[PDB]
């Protein structure tokens, strides 16, 4: 029954008495459900420490992972160049998943193509599929470059991308001067950040391998910047603004911010902005190359230091206060341009916010997860704020990164209770926050279920989630926020302090019970 003046969606229509009775009838008649007491007892057992031991003894089962496969990052990297069509050599089903993932996160149209390989191509290879796909894509969508990636199936079969592309070139399917870089991105190696690294190295090698004769370091007086797997537009914006504000000639390779924030003015632009091909060609002429995310740009660093002959600096991700300062000082030293008064004014304002909010920020316990560099810089910033990161989780981390984070933690008195987990999934984190409760969680939308679990144990056991990372699905337009630099530090600080104060306001809203602490001024 629905009222025409007040129409109810699934919630709370299915809370009606008739729907409740029908659900109860179904459950008691045909579902053969376990008794409610048994369910409650099993749930209680899942929150105990013995369950945590059994869950940490897992060796083959992965539950609720916090990472994706390489071609997703490869497609994101391919999206950062001008009029470049991301091409995935493999079956068509996974390209749809990539597009759906990026559509749900960015809330923008994402363009990608696949050659739709089938078991007939599985038994004989995908050479003809590659030829037809290249020809059809070039004829239909008119790109100036096609970046080729591999689905895990083409990797298991063992298709040679170079041979297939060359054969397509010499048989008239595509013009011989058409740039078609390729990269091998096995989905069973690393994660999406590794795919981004593979695709970027493939494009750089395609554009700057055979032309390394008329190349002099520092000719154009520009600095190359590689952003890595970045899902915040504000990060690209802040890097560009910080570099242009102090008069430093820069060259942002693979920036997708223009194509992922196109305006809605009655027309559809499939391509917009990006890195030009001449920009990639002129890359080795730069004085130096700066990697914003070194810990997943290892192969790119190897190629840059081995072919471009660029002395890549030992720089962390520009997140926090000390690391942003170090990045600015290194760029100033490389380019010879002094840091202007505006940047130091911004730094002073950020220190002002830290000083104003240290009282509420001090001592709070956070359990955070995400990509390695983002996680490590977030831990550094939390240690700068006097915060306590107790559970640090990185599914796609390695022992080297874990040792680096341990060295970072040991240099601060607030890292005494900090433990770093690599290779562990979100079920491990659920057990961790159940057996050692922090004050808040910091991660993507996939943590929103863990919060629910805690709320079932009790209100006093709930661990609220703070949505900072990738992917954020349940909130709108959070991809436009900033994460790197002073501006990103201000945004993160504001989010943390306001989440803490909102939690306090919720906890102290009980009239005649806890409203004695319902302060107007906080």
């Amino acid at each position: 029954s629905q009222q025409v003046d007040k129409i109810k969606a699934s919630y709370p229509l299915f809370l009606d008495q008739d729907y409740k009775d029908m659900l109860a009838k179904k459950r008691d008649g045909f579902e053969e459900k376990y008794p409610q007491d048994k369910i409650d007892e099993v749930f209680q057992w899942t929150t105990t420490k013995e369950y945590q031991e059994l869950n940490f003894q897992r060796e083959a089962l992965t539950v609720n992972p916090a990472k994706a496969c390489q071609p997703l990052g490869a497609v994101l990297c391919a999206l950062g160049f001008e009029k470049t069509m991301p091409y995935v050599h493999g079956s068509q089903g996974c390209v749809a998943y990539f597009r759906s993932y990026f559509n749900r996160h960015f809330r923008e149209p994402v363009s990608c193509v696949s050659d739709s390989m089938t078991e007939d191509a599985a038994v004989f290879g995908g050479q003809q599929n590659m030829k037809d796909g290249l020809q059809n894509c070039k004829a239909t969508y008119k790109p100036d470059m096609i970046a080729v990636s591999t689905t895990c199936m083409a990797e298991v079969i063992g298709d040679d991308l170079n041979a297939f592309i060359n054969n397509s070139k010499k048989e008239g399917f595509i013009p011989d001067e058409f740039p078609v870089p390729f990269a091998h991105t096995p989905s069973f190696v690393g994660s999406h950040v590794t795919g981004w690294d593979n695709m970027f190295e493939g494009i750089a090698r395609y554009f700057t391998l055979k032309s390394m004769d008329d190349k002099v370091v520092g000719s154009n007086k520009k600095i190359n910047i590689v952003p890595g797997f970045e899902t915040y537009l504000g990060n690209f914006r802040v890097i560009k603004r910080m570099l242009s504000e102090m008069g430093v000639g820069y060259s942002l390779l693979s920036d997708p911010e223009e194509v992922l924030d196109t305006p809605a003015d009655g027309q559809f632009r499939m391509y917009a902005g990006g890195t030009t091909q001449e920009e990639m060609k002129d890359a080795p002429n730069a004085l130096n190359t700066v990697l914003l995310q070194p810990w997943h740009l290892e192969k790119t660093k190897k190629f840059v230091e081995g072919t471009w002959k660029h002395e890549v600096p030992k720089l962390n991700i520009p997140m926090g206060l000390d690391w942003t300062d170090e990045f600015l000082m290194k760029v100033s030293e490389i380019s010879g341009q002094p840091i202007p008064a505006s940047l130091t004014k911004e730094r002073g304002r950020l220190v002002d916010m830290m000083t104003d909010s240290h009282t509420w920020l001090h001592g709070k316990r956070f359990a955070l997860w995400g990509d390695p560099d983002f996680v490590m810089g977030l831990v550094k910033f939390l240690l700068e704020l006097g915060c306590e990161p107790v559970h640090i989780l990185c599914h796609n981390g390695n022992k080297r990164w874990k040792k680096a984070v341990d060295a970072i933690l040991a240099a601060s008195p607030y890292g005494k209770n900090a433990t770093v987990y690599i290779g562990k999934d979100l079920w491990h984190l659920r057990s961790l926050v159940f057996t050692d409760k922090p004050d808040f969680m910091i991660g993507n939308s996939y943590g929103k279920f863990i919060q629910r679990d805690t709320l079932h144990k009790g209100k006093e056991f709930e661990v609220p989630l703070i949505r900072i990372g990738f992917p954020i699905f349940d909130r709108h337009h959070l991809h436009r926020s900033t994460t790197l630099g002073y501006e990103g530090a201000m945004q993160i600080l504001t989010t943390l302090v306001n989440s803490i104060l909102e939690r306090l306001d919720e906890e102290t809203r009980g009239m005649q019970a806890t409203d004695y602490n319902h302060d107007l001024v906080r």
Binding site: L321, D322, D325, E326, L328, M329, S332, I339, T344, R347, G348, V351, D352, M354, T355, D356, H358, T359, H362, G363, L383, E384, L385, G386, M511, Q512, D515, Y516, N517, D519, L520, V521, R522
Partner: protein, 477 residues
């Protein structure tokens, strides 16, 4: 120590002032001598502020409505006059209470006459009567009404006393008019006196012919504790665990019934001298109730005050006091053991108007911290008589210090911490000196008693030792 260069520092700071301002301000800055019992020969207080020097003092309306009458929960306080005076003072003070707001408690509320020009010109008393009628209509569970007058009420000429009498007789309910105009008095100090006079004249003598209260020989009354962050409850639990029964609290979490029942009490426990010594003296003269001052800041002062209070009763109360001291010894001993090493030997400057700076000094010294300078915006000469013994030799004393004077003193002395109000918090946070909001406990607390000492120590450690203070200077500067 080092009184000579602090004297010369006072001379240098006083050099920018005009001759008259310099001459007056020279009397309010002093060098502490602990061997002095009469501060009148060293410092001068309770004088008017020099115009245009950015004083921190307030008005008598703040010291009456916002301090004494505000914490009373079941009464309705009407800010008679323009809106702003009650607007800026709404919920700005963390006097904690238990009650259903808007039904039987009205502390965080703002009732005001909201005077317009036609009210400024044509009377205003009939508006007050209509306001009282509307208040009785919409808020039937209130147990009294106070009318705190603002600046224009006295200026235009109004008789709120006749309206109070007439409406109290008509509605059979107490109405207390308080002539707490801002221009009356040089600071909040006179507001305390005016509010105390209003309580004495309109509330205190209500239950004089009543003898239905069953009084016990252990009855006490907490006077001068306004429950900031729950301070009064932390003192109350210690007093009750000692075997005493408290029937009144003045005025944090207080009620009209506690005020009316206070004259049936055997001992008056006065925490804040400055704000309630008038009513304590009146109740001593009239009802013969003795009164004493106590201090619950830090463990040493808490133990001293507990023993002094127990000394006024029989031996059972003393044994109970020993029991509670033994019970609470390990708690504060552990707090000291944990927090003193991080705070040992660090210098602090204080500037809170009224009783708090002399009281907090014992709690600071308990954690190995030393107070190098102190002062009160509105304290009188008896307060300075009381605080000279507490403070160390050749330390700085100021009274109604201006913004420039305080900033110069802080820059020259360079203390490790400053405890003061919101008006100077960000000024000193810009210069890189850790700051604590003594008036509001930086939205933390309570600080009274053993339960409050742990929170005090944790707060001071979290503020003084915060890493943010080491990033003030850019690495490329």
């Amino acid at each position: 120590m080092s009184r000579e260069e602090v004297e010369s520092l006072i001379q240098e700071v006083l050099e920018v002032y005009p001759e008259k301002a310099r001459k007056d301000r020279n009397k309010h800055l002093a060098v502490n001598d602990p061997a002095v019992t009469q501060s009148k020969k060293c410092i001068i207080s309770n004088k008017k502020s020099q115009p245009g020097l950015m004083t921190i003092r307030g008005c008598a309306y703040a010291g009456s409505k916002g301090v004494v009458w505000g914490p009373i929960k079941d009464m309705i306080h009407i800010s008679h006059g323009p809106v702003g005076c009650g607007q800026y003072s709404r919920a700005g003070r963390r006097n904690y209470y238990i009650g259903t707001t808007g039904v039987n408690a009205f502390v965080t509320m703002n009732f005001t006459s909201d005077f317009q020009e036609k009210d400024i010109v044509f009377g205003g008393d009939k508006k007050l009567a209509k306001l009282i009628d509307e208040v009785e209509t919409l808020f039937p569970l209130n147990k009294g009404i106070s009318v705190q007058s603002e600046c224009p009420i006295g200026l235009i000429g109004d008789d709120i006393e006749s309206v109070s009498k007439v409406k109290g007789a008509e509605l059979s309910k107490t109405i207390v008019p308080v002539r707490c105009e801002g221009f009356r008095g040089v600071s909040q100090s006179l507001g305390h006196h005016i509010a105390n006079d209003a309580v004495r004249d309109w509330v205190l003598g209500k239950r004089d012919e009543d003898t239905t209260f069953a009084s016990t020989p252990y009855d006490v009354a907490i006077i001068g504790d306004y429950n900031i962050g729950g301070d009064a409850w932390s003192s109350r639990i210690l007093l009750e665990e000692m075997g005493l029964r408290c029937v009144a609290q003045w005025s944090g979490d207080g009620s009209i019934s506690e005020i009316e029942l206070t004259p049936k009490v055997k001992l008056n426990l006065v925490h804040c001298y400055r704000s309630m010594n008038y009513i304590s003296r009146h109740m001593e003269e009239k009802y013969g109730i003795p009164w004493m001052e106590y201090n619950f800041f830090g463990p040493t002062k808490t133990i001293e005050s507990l023993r002094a209070i127990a000394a006024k009763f029989d031996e059972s109360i003393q044994k109970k006091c020993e029991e509670v001291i033994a019970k609470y010894k390990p708690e504060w001993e552990a707090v000291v053991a944990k927090y003193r090493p991080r705070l040992e030997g660090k210098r602090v400057m204080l500037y809170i108007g009224g009783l708090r700076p002399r009281h907090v000094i014992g709690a600071y010294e308990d954690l190995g911290m030393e107070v190098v300078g102190t002062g009160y915006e509105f304290a009188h000469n008896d307060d300075y008589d009381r605080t000279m013994k507490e403070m160390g030799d050749s330390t700085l004393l100021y009274d109604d210090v201006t913004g420039y004077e305080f900033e110069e003193f802080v820059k020259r002395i360079k203390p490790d911490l400053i405890g003061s109000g919101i008006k100077e918090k960000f000024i000193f946070q810009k210069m890189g000196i850790p700051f604590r909001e003594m008036h509001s406990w930086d939205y933390s607390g309570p600080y009274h008693g053993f339960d409050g000492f742990a929170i005090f120590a944790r707060d001071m450690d979290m503020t003084l030792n915060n890493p943010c203070w080491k990033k003030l200077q850019a690495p490329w500067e």
